[PDB]
Amino acid sequence: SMSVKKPKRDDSKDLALCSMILTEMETHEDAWPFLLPVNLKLVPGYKKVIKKPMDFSTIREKLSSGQYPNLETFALDVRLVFDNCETFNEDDSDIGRAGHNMRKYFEKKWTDTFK
Amino acid sequence: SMSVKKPKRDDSKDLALCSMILTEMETHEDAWPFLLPVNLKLVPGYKKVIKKPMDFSTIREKLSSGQYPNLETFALDVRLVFDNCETFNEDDSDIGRAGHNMRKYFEKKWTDTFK
């Protein structure tokens, strides 16, 4: 509260660390469904069903232009990529399986890096 | 943004300074309408019309128990006291005039202390 400060993380390396994690995500062989925005003009249903589209290129742009206030807003956007994938794609599908794999991959990097 | 820190105020004295300002408010001769909560059982209309009642004793309790995260939330509650007063009381009235006087009194102390 006012004039009662909680000891806080050293957050000085967060930007570099998130960039490294995102690079690992981008270079994963199962990243292909998530590198670019879903084409709203060519994919039926997507625009109406997925209220907040997100993809790695968009995350990279936001990270590079100071659009994440902190760690957690970055992780929210990454998780949004996989939440959208799960909403739109059957678990059994190639894209569906890619999403589950990439989510697991991310969360391990996340824990190992910040926890 | 992430890992880009803005130079910040020294806020270490804010708690003490707000307490001093509130003491000056409490001891002002025109503070009498605002020292205790308006009696909702005895004052017709108040409960329905004033959605967020506030008074100096309530502010003092919140300040003393860590319920203001920062300066600005404290100032919001003080201003709420006078906004409520203006809503419910004619400018011409004793209480109405007291509110205008106390608002002016507060804002001068506020500027002189933090600006």
Ligand SMILES: Cc1ccc(O)c(CO)n1
């Ligand atoms: C390329 C791609 C990636 C993710 C996704 O949900 C879709 C829609 O089937 N398409």
Ligand SMILES: Cc1ccc(O)c(CO)n1
């Ligand atoms: C004592 C007091 C203080 C402020 C106020 O608005 C009222 C309602 O007339 N009564």
